[PDB]
């Protein structure tokens, strides 16, 4: 993550991120809506950071310091480049919507009134087909990736040595290889909970309530399709096991 976005999202809530004299000028209903919107952006920023740990720290570190095959690394971090592209683009739109909403003379005081339109765009058309195919692929290769990691850690001395070294910093405490894989798999199921709670405090403007109700329906349709598209791969699985 970059310092600028980390400081903008360091506080535990929107009510604590903005100046208290700016907070005091708003209704409680607005504060409640803005707190859940802030949590959606803060967790998207953390998710993109998890994918950068997977591509830059783990994946590239293995390719540059170890003598493993490129197909081993691909099995350990499936679709990480595609996933990083999708979520970095989504995060860029969320951060621009916040920046556009800032008060002149301020880098922290803002109110996001429109979000549903941005959520409909992300979860519809070509961008939704690409998240659907990418998550169906990722979640079907999840078990194989964990099994491949465990095989390499217990058999390869230099792989075990690499892991102990790059995961030693305190900032990586909850971000090992297996933790990053489950963090990515669980991300998609957080969106309906966040969007439903934002919708709960977005009844003031009818266009916004409808845009968020449409966005909630799109995320649920996407999740149902990713769930249907999953067929868990096994390393060294035989054709007979598959067609039975």
């Amino acid at each position: 993550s970059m310092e600028m976005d980390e400081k903008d999202f360091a506080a535990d809530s929107w009510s604590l991120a903005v100046d208290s004299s700016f907070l005091q000028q708003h209704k409680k209903e607005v504060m409640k809506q803005q707190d859940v919107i802030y949590e959606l952006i803060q967790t998207e920023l953390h998710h993109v950071r998890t994918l950068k740990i997977m591509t830059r720290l783990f994946r590239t570190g293995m390719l540059e310091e170890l003598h493993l095959e490129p197909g081993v690394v691909q099995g350990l971090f499936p679709c990480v480049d595609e996933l990083s592209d999708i979520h970095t683009r989504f995060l860029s739109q969320l951060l621009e919507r916040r920046r556009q909403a800032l008060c002149p003379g301020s880098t922290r005081n803002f109110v996001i009134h429109r979000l549903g339109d941005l959520l409909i765009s992300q979860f519809s058309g070509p961008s939704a087909e690409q998240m659907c195919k990418t998550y169906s692929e990722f979640c079907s290769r999840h078990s194989k990736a964990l099994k491949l990691y465990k095989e390499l850690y217990a058999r390869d001395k230099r792989f075990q040595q690499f892991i102990r070294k790059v995961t030693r910093p305190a900032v990586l405490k909850r971000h090992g290889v297996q933790e990053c894989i489950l963090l990515v798999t669980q991300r998609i199921t957080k969106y309906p909970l966040l969007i439903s709670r934002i919708l709960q405090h977005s009844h003031g403007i009818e266009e916004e309530r409808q845009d968020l109700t449409t966005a909630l329906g799109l995320v649920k349709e996407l999740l149902s399709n990713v769930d249907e598209g999953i067929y868990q791969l096994e390393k060294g699985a035989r054709l007979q096991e598959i067609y039975n």
Partner: protein
Amino acid sequence: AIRKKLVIVGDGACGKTCLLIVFSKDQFPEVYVPTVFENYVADIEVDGKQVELALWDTAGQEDYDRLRPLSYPDTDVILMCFSIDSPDSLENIPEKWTPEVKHFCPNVPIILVGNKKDLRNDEHTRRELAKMKQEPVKPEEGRDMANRIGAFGYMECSAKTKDGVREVFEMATRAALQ
């Protein structure tokens, strides 16, 4: 410090996200309660043993039967939650959650946890349940269910008052070590 994995399961709104938040947060959330929980690695010292306990939630995965089991690999302890203001959530324990957890996590100890014990003597809770011929889950109904499903043990807590929370996680650490 050995590494152990904990997963919390149970119906939506059974208080499992709140339970993980109140345990992992150093200070009680007085300003904002987060909607979701990502993960957390707790440093726990129980009976003289130091353990790194990784905490995971299944909230959001209850309607997705092919995504949900991806949370189970290498689990060392399962916290199976129900809500004490919800007898319907206790009824779903032996037919839905228990067969799923025993299939994907064979031999993994399960601790049955009765959440929201503060609502047992709440007037709004008792009035609302009485309008459906019901009452809050009694302690013996929780223990009889834990006994019936083959649980490692039965425990109660309140994420709102923090009572019993530390005890649940220290006992889960002990169960993961066996």
